């Protein structure tokens, strides 16, 4: 009875259903615009919080009290389970092997007791490391005891490393000046480097012929920095190693980086490990397929989730290193 079911619904609901079926949500509108606004009143005031608190308090005070039909008393109205008890095993036998050996083990401490407990085969009673050092040698080594609680390994403390002392503006100024005595630029783990500043570094290294290695590890770099570096790599002929590990570069940015590899023959090591999100297998397929195009790159640090692209990338690295070996051999003879 479709007509009766529709008549059971409200007529205003029927008109709303017709309007909603005509609207079908808002798929055409973007994600932000598809929501309706709450009220039409303009924003006013610097949000005085105490007025909110006082209004809420008096609103709570002048409220009519709902009275519940049945009060709660915590009454248990069902049968208690009362778990069963067992008669268990009431056995008692004395072994009494030797008056000598009675008194020998009667006054032994628990730490030395656990050695003879473990040598007889109660492996369940104590920990495994304790159990094995008990069986290690013919002497009492066990200090802890079977009853005592086990504790984790502490390993060894590591001394604190000095924080990064490489300043930003002077380094960029020296890079822009083509300084002959600046070869390594380190930017690892520096607080709050501006994105336009990193881009300024990216165009600054375009014309620098004296810096051989670069690193922006842990700089919270993003896709525009990746795009600018990808643009820079085509021009530059001196940079040996680029390190962009531990960043927020998306898959498309990494694709832009690998797409610059055929144009330049000066980069030998590139590391893109530990990114915030996985790149996806399509990006991996593109990376490996057109990294097979390049013949200069030797070291590439990336953990491939799939097996096919990983195998092909390993083969490509093997081929590049074997080309180096072959040209050395041909140069010798």
């Amino acid at each position: 009875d479709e007509d009766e079911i529709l008549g059971a619904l409200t007529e205003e609901e029927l008109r709303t259903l017709e309007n909603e079926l005509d609207e079908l949500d808002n798929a055409l509108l973007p994600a932000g615009l598809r929501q309706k606004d709450q009220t039409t009143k303009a924003p006013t005031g610097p949000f005085k919080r105490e007025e909110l608190l006082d209004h809420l308090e008096k609103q709570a005070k002048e409220f009519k009290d709902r009275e519940d039909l049945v009060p709660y008393t915590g009454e248990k109205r069902g049968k208690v389970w009362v778990p069963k008890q067992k008669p268990m095993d009431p056995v008692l036998e004395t072994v009494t092997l030797e008056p000598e050996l009675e008194e020998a083990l009667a006054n032994a401490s628990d730490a030395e007791l656990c050695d003879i407990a473990a040598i007889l085969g109660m492996h369940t009673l104590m920990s495994n490391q304790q159990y094995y050092q008990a069986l290690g040698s013919s002497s009492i080594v066990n200090k802890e005891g079977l009853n005592s609680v086990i504790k984790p390994t502490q390993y060894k403390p590591v001394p604190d490393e000095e924080p990064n002392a490489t300043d930003v503006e002077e380094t960029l100024e020296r890079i822009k000046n083509n300084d002959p005595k600046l070869e390594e630029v380190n930017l690892n783990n520096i607080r709050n480097i501006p994105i336009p500043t990193l881009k300024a570094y990216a165009e600054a290294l375009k014309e620098n012929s004296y810096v051989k290695k670069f690193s922006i590890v842990g700089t919270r770099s993003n896709d525009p920095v990746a795009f600018a570096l990808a643009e820079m790599l085509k021009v530059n002929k001196v940079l040996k190693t680029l390190n962009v590990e531990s960043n927020f570069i998306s898959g498309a940015g990494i694709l832009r980086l690998v797409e610059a590899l055929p144009y330049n023959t000066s980069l030998v090591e590139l590391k893109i490990d530990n990114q915030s999100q996985p790149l996806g297998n399509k990006v991996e397929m593109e990376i490996v397929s057109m990294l097979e195009k390049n013949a200069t790159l030797l070291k590439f640090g990336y953990h491939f989730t799939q097996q096919g692209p990983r195998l092909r990338a390993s083969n490509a690295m093997m081929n590049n290193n074997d080309l180096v070996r072959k040209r050395r051999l041909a140069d010798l003879t």
Partner: protein, 374 residues
């Protein structure tokens, strides 16, 4: 004719629903909150019958402290459970628990004491004749009408993804991520405090939750959304407070749900929900992966963000192989669908074998739930 069937009680982390089996909609919907007088003994012990429950608790937000008895899907306080359950049985449903079987839901990988304690409360306090415990994700797959697919369920305490192929569950591929809407509420407060609106207590918690429900959306592109929000103010909206003051959210509308996809904002070392679904699919066999790609089902109240489905489809298609197709089923009624699953599952004629009757409980105790259920 079995005493108008059983009762379906979907006790979610932040809000509880209850109703009769065989009905499409739950009869009672109310938050799972216990409100107590805060610190004072003023006005002749004002705040009498100190436990305020449900709608009456949120009515007196100013003069009370609101406590959630369920945190992360685990019962911290059991007296508050049995108070809430008494309120459901007597104050709203107005039916006796002695003649009606009860169906209950729980998270997949929960500590084992919860099932035994729920069985003890059902059989010792409300003396129900029969009871069963199920999983919300299986109920969601029941509500979707399909017998093959992967189910995400994200409530206020827990997110879990399970795969099911042809009615056979794969226990090794079930995942549990502890990133839910409460964390999004806290992150929304954190980013609102930077703008200038500081929200601290439980009344502020309810207000911020209402703001999040009414004004949030999942951006398709995060950096494009940042550029748009910095360039112009068209994305900005206005929210009025109960007293009358009006504030502007603006940049905070899409940053709140983005922590679902990037947990680095929340301060958690975890992967996104899309990575959880993809890893749950990779943990299955080779052949049944394709169907799990074509039957992704969303559920829970958290998935009512606008544009979550298209964004997560884009992410999955970024991860998945390009040969096969990806589709996402996002019913508009999914927030209640878990309960609807119970309304299906208690309605089946073959389920009458699966009830845990009182006679077996009186011989086995609360441990029988480990053998009878799942």
């Amino acid at each position: 004719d079995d005493d108008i069937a059983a009762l379906v009680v979907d006790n979610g982390s932040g809000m509880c629903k209850a109703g009769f089996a065989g009905d499409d909609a739950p009869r009672a919907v109310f938050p799972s909150i216990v409100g107590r007088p805060r610190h004072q003994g003023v006005m002749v012990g004002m705040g009498q019958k100190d436990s305020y429950v449900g709608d009456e608790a949120q009515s007196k937000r100013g003069i009370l402290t609101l406590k959630y008895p369920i945190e992360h899907g685990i019962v911290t306080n059991w007296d508050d459970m049995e108070k809430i359950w008494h309120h459901t049985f007597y104050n709203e449903l107005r039916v006796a628990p002695e003649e009606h079987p009860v169906l209950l839901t729980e998270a997949p990988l929960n500590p084992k004491a919860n099932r035994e304690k729920m069985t003890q409360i059902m059989f010792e306090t409300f003396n129900t004749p029969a009871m069963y415990v199920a999983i919300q994700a299986v109920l969601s797959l029941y509500a979707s009408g399909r017998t093959t697919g992967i189910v995400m369920d994200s409530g206020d305490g827990v997110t879990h993804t399970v795969p099911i192929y042809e009615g056979y569950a794969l226990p090794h591929a079930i995942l549990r991520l502890d990133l839910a809407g409460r964390d999004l509420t806290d992150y929304l407060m954190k980013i609102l405090t930077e703008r200038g609106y500081s929200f601290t207590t439980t009344a502020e918690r309810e207000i911020v939750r209402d703001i999040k429900e009414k004004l949030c959306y999942v951006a398709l592109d995060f950096e494009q959304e940042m550029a748009t929000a910095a360039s112009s103010s068209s994305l900005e909206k206005s929210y009025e407070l109960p007293d009358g003051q009006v504030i502007t959210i603006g940049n905070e509308r899409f940053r709140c749900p983005e922590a679902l996809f990037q947990p680095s904002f929340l301060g958690m070392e975890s992967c996104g929900i899309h990575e959880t679904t993809f890893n749950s699919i990779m943990k299955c066999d080779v052949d049944i992966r394709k169907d799990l790609y074509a039957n992704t089902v969303l559920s829970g109240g958290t998935t009512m963000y606008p544009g979550i489905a298209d964004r997560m489809q884009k992410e999955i298609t970024a991860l998945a192989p390009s040969t096969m197709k990806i589709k996402i089923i996002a019913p508009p009624e999914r927030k209640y669908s878990v309960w609807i699953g119970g309304s299906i599952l208690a309605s089946l004629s073959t389920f009458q074998q699966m009830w845990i009757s009182k006679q077996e409980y009186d011989e086995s105790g609360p441990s029988i739930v480990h053998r009878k259920c799942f």
